[PDB]
């Protein structure tokens, strides 16, 4: 799509978050 944004935004959050949910959900909707 020629209209997508081709820029980088250097001030995006450069850090990782160890305190993020490390588990997965088997109960999430498997359909779409």
């Amino acid at each position, epitope marked *: 799509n020629p209209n997508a944004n081709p820029n980088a935004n250097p001030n995006a959050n450069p850090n990782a978050n160890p305190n993020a949910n490390p588990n997965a959900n*088997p*109960n999430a909707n*498997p359909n*779409a």
Partner: antibody
Framework: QVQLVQSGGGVVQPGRSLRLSCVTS????????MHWVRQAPGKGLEWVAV????????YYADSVRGRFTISRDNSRNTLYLQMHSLRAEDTAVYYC?????????????????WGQGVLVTVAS | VLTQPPSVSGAPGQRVTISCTGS?????????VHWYQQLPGTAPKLLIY???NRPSGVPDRFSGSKSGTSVSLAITGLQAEDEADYYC???????????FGTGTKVTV
């Protein structure tokens, strides 16, 4: 209109592999997630495996993990459960079930349409 | 993991109720419990889903409700066509695996 037909049962000696299949018709197969449910003879139902619509994410029960493998051939409306190292406890009727599309606050996957039921016997 | 009475009974025409007791992570966590009807042979079919929502084709004699950490399946009429095994199903967050009940036989 909806239909789930199964095949692949029989008697398998312990330690040998076996593959079950579930051919579907009457609905858009790629758009639905699917389960396998095992019913020991005279016991209650229990869960075996679930596969997402595209097949990216799969989750197995504890007692079948590392031996069983669930997969789908999305281009010809069929679902598989590949069983390896079949032990003596993996004897039951295996049902192929489809995850129903519904929305609720406390959503938990429900299986609206079920396969016919295939018997797998492990003996001798 | 979900506990149900071994069996229930009643004269035809009367009402019966099947219970399904779960822990704080199965039903107390807010997860819906679905019920399946299993005739001999005859792979089980969805009976009620999401704490009592009836799918199309199920007679109005079947209903359900949620109360605390256990639910119930109220059957009215109790006809000979209801002779079957009824199983719960819900998701256990502590195990992160779908849980089926021990199942109850309705003998009428």
């Amino acid at each position: 209109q909806v239909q789930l037909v199964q095949s692949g049962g029989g008697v398998v000696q312990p330690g040998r592999s076996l593959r079950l299949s579930c051919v579907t018709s009457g609905f858009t197969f790629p758009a639905f997630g699917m389960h396998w449910v095992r019913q020991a003879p005279g016991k209650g139902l229990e869960w075996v495996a679930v596969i997402w619509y595209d097949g990216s994410k799969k989750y197995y029960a504890d007692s079948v993990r590392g031996r069983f493998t669930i997969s789908r051939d999305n281009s010809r409306n069929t679902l598989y459960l590949q069983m390896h190292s079949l032990r003596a406890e993996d004897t039951a009727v295996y049902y192929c079930a489809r995850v129903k599309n519904y929305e609720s606050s406390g959503y938990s996957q429900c299986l609206d349409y079920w396969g016919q039921g295939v018997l797998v016997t492990v003996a001798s | 993991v979900l506990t149900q009475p071994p069996s229930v009974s009643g004269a035809p025409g009367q009402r019966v109720t099947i219970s399904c007791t779960g822990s704080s992570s199965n039903i107390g966590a807010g997860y819906d419990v679905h019920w399946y009807q299993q005739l001999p042979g005859t792979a089980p079919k969805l009976l009620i889903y999401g704490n009592g929502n009836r799918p199309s084709g199920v007679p109005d004699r079947f209903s359900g409700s949620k109360s605390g950490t256990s639910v119930s399946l109220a059957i009215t009429g109790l006809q000979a066509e209801d002779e079957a095994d009824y199983y719960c199903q819900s998701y256990d967050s502590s195990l992160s695996a779908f849980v089926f009940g021990t199942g109850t036989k309705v003998t009428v």
